[PDB]
Write a protein that binds this ligand. Structure first.
Ligand SMILES: *[C@@H]1O[C@H](CO[C@@H]2O[C@@H](C)[C@@H](O)[C@@H](O)[C@@H]2O)[C@@H](O[C@@H]2O[C@H](CO)[C@@H](O[C@@H]3O[C@H](CO[C@H]4O[C@H](CO)[C@@H](O)[C@H](O)[C@@H]4O)[C@@H](O)[C@H](O[C@H]4O[C@H](CO)[C@@H](O)[C@H](O)[C@@H]4O)[C@@H]3O)[C@H](O)[C@H]2NC(C)=O)[C@H](O)[C@H]1NC(C)=O
Ligand SMILES: *[C@@H]1O[C@H](CO[C@@H]2O[C@@H](C)[C@@H](O)[C@@H](O)[C@@H]2O)[C@@H](O[C@@H]2O[C@H](CO)[C@@H](O[C@@H]3O[C@H](CO[C@H]4O[C@H](CO)[C@@H](O)[C@H](O)[C@@H]4O)[C@@H](O)[C@H](O[C@H]4O[C@H](CO)[C@@H](O)[C@H](O)[C@@H]4O)[C@@H]3O)[C@H](O)[C@H]2NC(C)=O)[C@H](O)[C@H]1NC(C)=O
Ligand code: HEM
Ligand code: HEM
Ligand SMILES: *[C@@H]1O[C@H](CO)[C@@H](O)[C@H](O)[C@H]1NC(C)=O
Ligand SMILES: *[C@@H]1O[C@H](CO)[C@@H](O)[C@H](O)[C@H]1NC(C)=O
Ligand SMILES: *[C@@H]1O[C@H](CO)[C@@H](O)[C@H](O)[C@H]1NC(C)=O
Ligand SMILES: *[C@@H]1O[C@H](CO)[C@@H](O)[C@H](O)[C@H]1NC(C)=O
Ligand SMILES: [Ca+2]
Ligand SMILES: [Ca+2]
Ligand SMILES: [Cl-]
Ligand SMILES: [Cl-]
Lengths: 466, 104, 466, 104
């Protein structure tokens, strides 16, 4: 049963069947590969099938540190008591640290450029090398961990490696929480849904359940509509870096070799700050680089990520569109006319009805990314309700939320409130001119860029234990 | 769960002291609505050909992608108020929250 | 591991440990036997353990018909096409039907009177012979199903056995729903909780989850505080029936032989109508016949039902008292003063704090039955919230609720609204003076009694298929 | 589930047509609150000696019954407003809704 090479529908495979006149796959006997998610209770005919979350639901930088103890220890530098995370011993990005390589049986990254022979990177989460821009964000955070452990060693020379690792890890987890709820989520939800689902923090509530709901694994995939079809690299003058200033995403999936032999992470971080995201429009949902060429270089056929999202919701047994609108307290359209009004687009509504037959059967990612966007938000009301409810739970139900009394001292929180991802890029790369905050909105060079020296640095003075 | 702890465990266990595996890794997702499967408990809609989902045939996901998601790349609208960093932080953040394992 | 013959704590046993200075079990190395409830996903180290409900959650008389197909077929009289349920082939109660006998390999009924050799009865649910009053109710409904299938055959000579069975079953299921929601629940919850949790029925809602919540299996055990220590039996003149008019409950558990050899079900039904229930009081929670002698004749030691209820909640992993008061939106007492105010009894509050330390640990059945009773109700605010919420879901989430459009005709619904449990007794027994409705309130003979002829009968005219 | 049906199935399956096992027999109970177990997922409070529940030792179920539930039987207060039939319908009704199996 190798779901990757076969189209036979035998467990654990659930391959995607091909329609007549498919734009790309002309053989209806072919299929797009698909493995059903691991069930939480194998073989039980008594339980309703449910899936597993291999990560901690908390926003704790687990993609940097790992969510299991063997892996976490292996990511650390155990050759000293400095509390550092291990770095690549063969390559460096202009003298700065790169991630360690993994030792995979069948390494996909080795397939993207066989002469270069650069394996996938190893990080706290298995998907670090999926696209080089993600690797750049993982590399940046690894460097920030080490920069902080170093500074902390100077302030407190008596601290041993464990304490140093734990204190820097605690600061990196708080930085991810602050950038996420202060800067990112307002731009996702827009101002009224933010007020509605994420009112001002009061205190940790142990009766709030912090688990990721099964639907959120599908609903947060709304970000696939933001993907541009290229990876852009800019030089120090924020000009196209030659050669390859724009390379198609189907040539960058698992391409860890571009990080090592094509310039490091700076060209890539510059490309991310000065290039706009793709706007999700009801007639421009997701690009063909991910709809037709996903993992083309390493799979027998290119995958269709929108289609994988729909198949995955069926695999996970998620209710359709109307059940989720009802859950959120939103009117549920029964007719194409009513659906036309909710979507404010009768042509889209009719196409949905032709495919699905009833709004009750629209797969949650398809219905959710089809709704008109909230004002100053990039998600419509169904997605806003699901993402907003999920993030309120992860904040209110986390005993280590950074604002929770006793997690940081009042002095440390005041220091922490000054962090920003513009500053972290300044302290760990060779980039000297960076975007003005909010970094998620800023995208035009030179209008939205400032010099790194005007950014507040994190002042670790309150971590000097006397 | 240790009565005093200054750091998070790696696994997330003991964050909620009353129900210590909540939010911990390698645990089943919580469901906000009962699941909907072709047989009621395990089989996905679209498994058996001819079985309808609430009176309507199941649409093929690749057909829905072809007819509604597909668009000409040359017409892409750049979001003038968001950088690509907005997309990337979203993927990084998703990876701190969920990874659904599959068989090898 | 036989949890009944040993005190070794090893799966599946979870024996109750004995306190110092126990009033009955002087050997602190003995224990009260206890088997953990079967897990829904056995052996998993991923799933949080949950238990199984072997019955249909719906209020469909499944205790009469069974909740599994082989069992339901075996309860039917398959020797003809009359749609009848099988009755006992060796005994009759003054010419009236009795339940068939079951064929249990280890039968507890046989042990209550070894010379009588009368086995346990067979009904849709396995606990029918637990106490003869419960057997009387099960017998009554069997007779009502057969009475009804006979009348329907007269009105509809061409209906076969399957149609007669289904149609009489559908009227018996509606009758249990009407007596429960019209006569029983108002007396349990009292008028203000009835309004709050069971507002007037509007329609079936398919998004309402009708499953029994784990906590309800423990919270509905509030009924153990209503048990009187005797099984009462009265004659046609509602005078004590000689001899044996009051037998200790520790001598009636599983005693099927008393239904068969001591008068049938009429003296038992009469005793249930003209004897008051025990009132639950804060200093008189449950009697010793169930606290000291439960199943004394068939177990190596008498069990303690209050203690099994609390141990069951720990086996089921149920949250303690405050977590359930918070779920219901009720104030959560943190101190003994606050617990004395919630309870309107400070002595009870100090006693609870001495045993539990914190209100967060009081087991749900113990905290629940300790609250002061709502006016004209028999449960306090926490249990009213949990029982009220559960019956609201079983009614709105049931596609076959009797008032749901299309289950019964308008004319049939009007005829069903006339049924009363006093009438079902008049029709299936030799009793001719019965309690005035509401039968759950009425208990004083001759004051609250009426002759059967004053009660309206169920008019089946609307069931004739023209 | 058949598109049309006139009587309930024995098992309760198909009463809810979108999620056909809801309310049907031999299915796990629904949880209104996350479970609380001594190890977070299977062991009951009171299983391991010395394991505290929320900072306080677990009270023996038999000790709580001895102390709070016990009362002199001849002091029983009869309920002037409810008949024993009110107690008996409660048990019969409970047996229509739930039965939690144990190993034999
Ligand atoms: C059919 O019944 C459906 C179920 O109804 C429940 O049970 C029945 C018996 C009744 O008792 C009923 O009163 C119960 O609600 C019913 O659908 C339900 O409808 C409500 C009301 O719209 C929905 O509530 C909304 O929930 C969302 C999502 O958050 C909820 O879930 C998360 C995670 O579980 C929790 O953490 C939250 O606390 C919520 O419980 C909320 O965001 C939303 O609140 C926000 O918006 C409202 C106004 O829209 C504001 O007042 C709030 O302050 C918030 O800002 C609502 O609370 C519920 O999710 C939904 N359940 C289901 C299963 O779909 C349906 O309405 C009934 N239909 C008819 C015609 O009767
Ligand atoms: C700590 O957080 C707790 C969790 O709160 C939820 O999630 C967080 C993230 C916030 O978004 C918060 O807004 C959410 O509510 C919180 O406890 C919660 O408190 C509410 C309000 O008391 C509780 O709701 C009550 O529920 C009962 C029981 O019915 C519910 O359960 C059934 C089965 O699932 C459903 O079908 C029902 O629809 C309900 O969902 C209701 O009977 C009750 O409504 C009745 O009483 C209220 C007053 O309480 C009246 O106004 C109504 O009109 C009704 O007549 C409430 O709906 C909720 O159950 C509870 N959750 C938990 C997990 O305990 C807690 O208060 C927080 N504390 C602080 C200090 O922050
Ligand atoms: C570099 C950009 C991104 C990808 C390449 C990519 C790819 C995937 C794939 C292959 C899956 C799994 C498909 C399946 O179900 O079979 C996937 C799932 C998830 N994504 Fe994707 N994604 C890229 C980018 C994003 C962005 C910008 C996201 C959100 C802001 C985003 C989210 C997610 C999530 C939450 C999942 C599910 C993860 C899980 O396993 O639980 N991704 N993505
Ligand atoms: C004739 C009077 C009653 C009993 C004798 C009796 C006995 C029990 C026992 C032994 C259990 C199991 C205890 C354990 O957990 O090991 C039990 C459970 C339940 N009861 Fe009992 N009960 C008698 C009477 C009543 C009344 C009047 C009740 C309600 C009004 C009532 C309820 C319940 C419930 C809901 C259960 C749980 C059933 C399940 O298996 O899910 N009982 N009872
Ligand atoms: C560990 O730390 C030292 C510097 O402190 C460095 O030279 C060495 O390469 C590190 N080892 C790894 C595996 O990162
Ligand atoms: C592979 O990597 C080499 C450097 O080792 C580079 O020159 C070459 O162009 C890469 N292959 C492709 C297809 O880009
Ligand atoms: C079946 O019905 C007939 C007639 O009512 C009756 O004589 C017979 O005893 C019944 N059989 C059983 C097993 O109940
Ligand atoms: C046992 O049943 C017989 C009839 O078989 C009855 O007379 C006898 O008294 C019963 N035994 C006891 C101990 O009551
Ligand atoms: Ca995490
Ligand atoms: Ca039932
Ligand atoms: Cl879900
Ligand atoms: Cl529960």
């Amino acid at each position: 049963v190798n779901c990757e090479t076969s189209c036979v529908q035998q467990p654990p495979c659930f391959p995607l069947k091909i329609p007549p006149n498919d734009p790309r796959i002309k053989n209806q006997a072919d299929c797009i590969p698909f493995f059903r998610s691991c069930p939480a209770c194998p073989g039980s005919n008594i339980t309703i099938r449910n899936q597993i979350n291999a990560l901690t639901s908390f926003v704790d930088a687990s993609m940097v540190y790992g969510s299991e103890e063997p892996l976490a220890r292996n990511l650390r530098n155990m050759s000293n008591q400095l509390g550092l995370l291990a770095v690549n011993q063969r390559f460096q990005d202009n003298g700065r640290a790169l991630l360690p390589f993994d030792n995979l049986h069948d390494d996909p990254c080795l397939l993207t450029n066989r002469s270069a022979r650069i394996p996938c990177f190893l990080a706290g989460d298995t998907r670090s090398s999926e696209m080089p821009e993600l690797t750049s964000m993982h590399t940046l955070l690894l460097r920030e961990h080490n920069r902080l452990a170093t500074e902390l060693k100077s302030l407190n020379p008596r601290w041993d490696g464990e304490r140093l690792y734990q204190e820097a890890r605690k600061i990196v987890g708080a930085m991810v929480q602050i950038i996420t709820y202060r800067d990112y989520l307002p731009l996702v939800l827009g101002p009224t849904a933010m007020r509605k689902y994420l009112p001002t923090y009061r205190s940790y509530n142990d009766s709030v359940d912090p688990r990721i709901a099964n639907v959120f694994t599908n609903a947060f995939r709304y970000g696939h509509t933001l993907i541009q079809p290229f990876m852009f690299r800019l030089d120090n003058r924020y000009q196209p870096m030659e050669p390859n200033p724009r390379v198609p995403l189907s040539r960058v999936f698992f391409a860890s070799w571009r990080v090592v032999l094509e310039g490091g992470i700076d060209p890539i971080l510059r490309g991310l700050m000065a290039t706009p995201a793709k706007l999700n429009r009801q007639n421009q949902i997701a690009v063909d680089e991910i709809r037709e060429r996903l993992f083309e270089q390493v799979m027998r056929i290119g995958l269709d990520l929108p289609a994988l999202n729909m198949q995955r919701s069926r695999d996970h047994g998620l209710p359709g569109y109307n059940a989720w609108r009802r859950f959120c307290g939103l009117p549920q359209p029964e007719t194409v006319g009513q659906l036309g009004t909710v979507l404010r687009n009768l042509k889209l509504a009719r196409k949905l009805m032709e495919q699905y037959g009833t709004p009750n059967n629209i797969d949650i990612w398809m219905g959710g990314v089809s709704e008109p966007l909230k004002r100053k938000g990039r998600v419509g009301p169904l997605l806003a309700c699901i993402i907003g409810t999920q993030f309120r739970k992860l904040r209110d139900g986390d005993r280590f939320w950074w604002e929770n009394e006793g997690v940081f001292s009042m002095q440390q929180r005041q220091a922490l409130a000054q962090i920003s991802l513009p500053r972290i890029i300044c302290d760990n790369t060779g980039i000297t001119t960076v975007s003005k905050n909010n970094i998620f909105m800023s995208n035009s060079y030179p209008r939205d860029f400032v010099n790194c020296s005007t950014l507040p640095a994190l002042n670790l003075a309150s971590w000097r234990e006397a | 769960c240790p009565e005093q702890d200054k750091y998070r465990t790696i696994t997330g266990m003991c964050n909620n002291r009353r129900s210590p595996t909540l939010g911990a890794s390698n645990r089943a997702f919580v469901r906000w609505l009962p699941a909907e499967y072709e047989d009621g408990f395990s089989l996905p809609y679209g498994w058996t050909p001819g079985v309808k989902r609430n009176g309507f045939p199941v649409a093929l996901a690749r057909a829905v992608s072809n007819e509604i998601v597909r668009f000409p790349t040359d017409q892409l609208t750049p979001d003038q108020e968001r950088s690509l960093m907005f997309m990337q932080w979203g993927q990084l953040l998703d990876h701190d929250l969920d990874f659904t394992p599959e068989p090898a």
